[PDB]
Design a protein around this ligand. Structure first.
Ligand SMILES: Nc1ncnc2c1ncn2[C@@H]1O[C@H](COP(=O)(O)OP(=O)(O)O)[C@@H](O)[C@H]1O
Ligand SMILES: Nc1ncnc2c1ncn2[C@@H]1O[C@H](COP(=O)(O)OP(=O)(O)O)[C@@H](O)[C@H]1O
Ligand SMILES: Nc1ncnc2c1ncn2[C@@H]1O[C@H](COP(=O)(O)OP(=O)(O)O)[C@@H](O)[C@H]1O
Ligand SMILES: Nc1ncnc2c1ncn2[C@@H]1O[C@H](COP(=O)(O)OP(=O)(O)O)[C@@H](O)[C@H]1O
Ligand code: BEF
Ligand code: BEF
Ligand code: BEF
Ligand SMILES: [Mg+2]
Ligand SMILES: [Mg+2]
Ligand SMILES: [Mg+2]
Ligand SMILES: [Mg+2]
Lengths: 294, 298, 299, 298, 261
């Protein structure tokens, strides 16, 4: 149990060093949560690779990344002009909120850690609750921390009191004897969330998360943005009426437009592979081209 | 407890030594490593499924080719990756699981047959661990394919009335399958396809359906696909000449693939029963090629 | 939480040893209970020569389920199309020989009949029901020429309501998957040599996906005229010879009675003479039975 | 947890010790069902306390008890002269069909277990089936036993399509354990377990349960003679005054069941003591006295 | 107050002792026939049972008495007095504590309360607004209640309702006594108000009919709520006089003007 735990702490040390450098001493519980620490260059997308979400993205910048990173500029404004202690991203599925979380992890650059539901659930008794202490202590040590819970229904409200204990301790250490620091700082740990079913999250997270951003479907020209964005590496040279494709996708979500673009791009490559499958070695270097075929 | 996990680990190590030929695993990746199946096991291939041929070319040119052997599809960037998943749906007995067996056999993509029994663990917080192990083993066996048959049971429309472990399984699955680290640092995301099959897509968790771009309907066989189902089912069954396959294909209209299989079974079982009833007046030695079907029975 | 496992494993090993010596394995914790469901042929005191009435269903079960399943060497020339049918569903009104057909199949087949009860499938903890449904087929495959029996299968394999329950729905899906899924055949193509016999009196409640997997569906009807007289003979084999009994009359007086109703009427008609003897014998000291009574009328 | 199970085990063991002689290893559900095996001396009623109806009270004693207990007289007939599979009492409320089952419990000495509706319905998935198996296995460990379900139409019932499916899945366990595969012995003798059930309605009981309760005795409203006998049995403690009679009371009350006559006689008996205490408030200290009248009180 | 399982513990939060109950018939009024009959038919068969030991189990306490009970103060409050004077160890039961969120939970509660009452040999089960018994899981709890009633003993079940016809036919069989508790429609309400005015007395006592005839159709709880505030109505003026006369001082001088409407 110690040798495997030693491998755990070694991998944690490597990951935390690669995060910090862009040292720390951790107990064996937060050497297991620090494995779920997302390095900055591990994300392929920034705020420029997202389309349609611009007012929400400026909200997340001006209220969640500036109040949480470089807070000295906000000493003039006082205390109310600061970052909340929790933000939520709700809306339909596929609309692009996990992508917002990914862009926040990449561009914000302040100790992002994504909590999976498995790291909160432990078979043994009690130690499934010390991991929440480890999460918050790690977020307090990695000072500009952004805790993230994707599909946030593990802290949703069989009860399984041990799981109830984990949820209650998460609520308590959310805003308890540590969320009101005498140093005039909340420690800058914004527990970002996300969920496509906003109703079932019962009451507590709805009061603990002041900012709640609805990621709608792209209405009438944000789908044009997502089309111009997904089709960034495909040769659409001869005749590709992008406005028609933006107008035909009536109520498709971002993932739906993305998969439609995937099919439309597979179309020329498919109809090329299906035609030159006779010379033996298929290469298919730059020969095909995109026209239509959504 | 170690006396059981050591035997388990030995078993999965032997299974993967059989499969991977032409790797460290934790206590959970092992328990899912018993699900990895080799193409030698499944006997069915794409050349054995009659009728639904339009779905075969779609799986080949849009799932298996983009997933296995991706060097062709590299010029188009991450847009030309394989789909996140596939959902084969239709009435029962039309070829969903048979397509699954063909994908297991005729792909060469480290097929992983995930049972509902293994996702659902008794101890607390082990179902989430089993899902994380499923997606960590599908990532180790890189161009892999996770197959959840009857996927509308494990997944499915979430509600307030459901076991607290099931909601965690669903959320953990969605997180691993279209989450933060579902794309590599270079941008090429995780050549892992979740192939599911169901006969009820209106109970399959639309948030999950968003993850499955390719949703193929396996329709009920028609007059032209039934004459291929009958051909495939009747391989070894030697036909008595004057056997009219067209009449049997036209009389079995409202039947599925399995119903046509069972009809052909009960039609080829007839001459053997005649053979048995005639040899009732003597001993029962080994069989022979004497009994031919008296006619095309239906 | 450990002695129960040792008790159940020793019991299942003893049971399997009994079935084997009627003519070992390493069973895990979950199929170690299903090994208790395995019944021996010497337990079931019923044979196909003991059922009455239905005779073209007995012929069907013998010819196209029992012979393909056990003793398959006669069918190794037709291929996988001559394998045993994956599923037989005996359906019909209550009390007309469904469970008796299952009992005769358990006794006469000699194919490792396993009487699966609805309790062993329904476990308390999360995932144990799925583990039991997997262990059923695992044990049936360890004992290849095997039959799985689920009496009153409609209450266990219902039509999959949209919000019925998760444990029941997962058990249904697990049973469907292990019935004929990815790993249901062999590496060569033999369909696993397992037949799950089900008995129900509500046919249109099983759900369509499951009736697909039981391709042979036998309606067990009510006894007609010649079936009622055969049921009467088979029931009255035990009673006295007769004191001028009339059986053709009783064969038609039982207008729409099922098999169990005919058996109960015969029970009452046989109890009547012993009651007469008890009444006439109370005047004496002790009962001390003999063979005085008769059998004439029961109505 | 473990302490609760051990306490239930100790209670069931003590109840078995008190029931056996006017030791058995058994699982937890049989521990819970063992808390219902009742001693015959725990009940005050007998076959002579049951006024009115006498044909039913003879049919039970002579075709359900003598076949069930004392089987050495019915041995020659074989499995066809065994005890009936089950017994059903039906009739309007208060006509003495639970008191009749109570007398069957007392005056039979046949391991009478009284199964409550709560013992069957459990909170966890798959515990009602465990307890049904427990009751049908404990009745077999107590071979000449009786299983009384009171208000059988509540526990059982015509299983609708859209039923609870946790009370309908237990409703099939009763049928499976009742008359199923292993519901006899290798020698061919039945299981000699008789299940007695009382109900106000038989058309709602079931269609598949009523065929295995072949003995069905209706407990009708008392006529003139039955009502007179019920009156003569209810008035055993009360002291008659030489003035009144019983015929006019037996004739006035017509639609009253057994329990309605019981409550009427209770009022008629409380009337004299009522008057005595009402004329005795400032009459010394009421401690004891015998001066009733039992005059005609409607 | 002894050993008991978790369900008897769940039901123990509603059980109360006799002495802890408020005043009995001395606390209420407005009826004499109903109180007299119920008293001499229940409290006597419970208090001093030695006087009935020669009866022979026939002239014992009734097994349950229903109440027609046009709604006033829960449509009845006689159960409190019956448990208080008889020392009956009043165990209460509500529909809220009778519903179920787990399968087979209401039946467990019913068996616990009846099992519970038996440890407490003298006991008064009380079904306020008894319609959860009559009448698809409620049928099972109905059958359970019927079976625990006499399905196989100094216990009484007080059933308050509002419609005799709505009760099941197998329930009126078990509740023989049908004590009607209608609204007070006579002049006796003044005595009601008398009791309702035994808390505090106004400046003089105004016209008794002036306060009586106004509540000619009001319920008993209606009278109790009117007089609990009408007499307090001018007292609010006295508190306002405290506020206007310097600061509020602890005084004991009542000053009524008119307690009506
Ligand atoms: N606003 C958007 N612009 C561009 N692509 C988007 C957008 N929203 C979603 N997508 C596409 O959806 C895929 C993942 O969607 P995701 O953010 O996981 O949806 P959700 O927010 O429901 O989790 C990405 O590959 C991305 O291409
Ligand atoms: N297109 C098909 N071609 C040949 N056989 C088929 C086809 N569809 C179904 N079958 C028959 O059905 C049986 C299994 O049915 P399956 O494909 O598993 O149904 P489902 O797709 O509903 O799971 C196989 O034995 C096969 O013989
Ligand atoms: N075909 C039959 N021949 C003889 N007896 C029968 C037949 N069908 C039903 N029975 C009688 O029914 C009783 C058991 O019925 P069972 O087979 O359990 O009914 P079901 O098939 O509805 O479960 C037996 O005692 C038997 O005497
Ligand atoms: N024939 C009878 N003789 C004497 N008492 C009777 C008779 N029938 C009913 N009773 C009375 O009714 C009570 C039993 O009611 P019961 O008839 O068992 O209810 P149900 O019929 O609804 O089960 C007994 O306590 C007894 O006093
Ligand atoms: F993350 Be997505 F909203 F399912
Ligand atoms: F697998 Be099939 F749809 F029943
Ligand atoms: F009750 Be039988 F099994 F139809
Ligand atoms: Mg997401
Ligand atoms: Mg399938
Ligand atoms: Mg049966
Ligand atoms: Mg009763």
């Amino acid at each position: 149990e110690k040798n495997e735990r030693t491998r755990i702490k070694a991998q944690e040390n490597l990951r935390r060093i690669r995060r910090k450098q862009i040292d720390l001493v951790l107990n064996e519980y937060e050497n297991q949560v620090a494995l779920e620490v997302v390095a900055p260059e591990d994300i392929p997308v920034g705020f420029n690779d997202i389309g349609g979400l611009d007012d929400i993205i400026e909200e997340l910048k001006e209220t969640i990344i500036y109040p949480l990173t470089m807070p000295h500029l906000y000493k003039h404004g006082g205390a109310l002009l600061a970052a909340p202690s929790g933000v939520l991203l709700y809306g339909p599925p596929g609309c692009g909120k996990t992508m917002l979380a990914k862009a926040v992890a990449h561009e914000s650059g302040a100790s992002f850690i994504n909590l999976h539901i498995s790291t909160l659930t432990e078979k043994w008794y009690g130690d499934s609750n010390k991991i929440v202490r480890a999460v918050f202590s790690l977020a307090k040590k990695l000072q500009p921390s952004i805790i993230f819970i994707d599909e946030i229904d593990a802290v949703l409200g069989g009860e399984h009191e041990a799981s109830g204990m984990v949820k209650a301790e998460f609520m308590t250490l959310w805003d308890g004897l540590t969320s009101t620091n005498a140093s005039g700082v909340p420690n800058r740990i914004v527990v970002l969330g996300a969920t496509n079913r906003i109703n079932d999250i019962d009451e507590a997270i709805l009061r603990r998360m002041p900012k709640q951003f609805p990621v709608p479907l792209p209405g009438l020209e944000q789908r044009r943005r997502i089309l111009e964005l997904v089709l960034r590496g495909t040769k659409r040279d001869p005749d590709f009426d992008l406005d028609y494709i933006a107008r035909v996708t009536a109520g498709m979500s971002g993932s739906d437009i993305k998969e439609t673009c995937r099919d439309a791009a597979m179309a020329p490559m498919r109809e090329y592979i299906r035609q030159h499958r006779a010379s033996g070695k298929p290469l298919s270097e730059i020969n095909p081209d995109d026209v239509r075929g959504i």
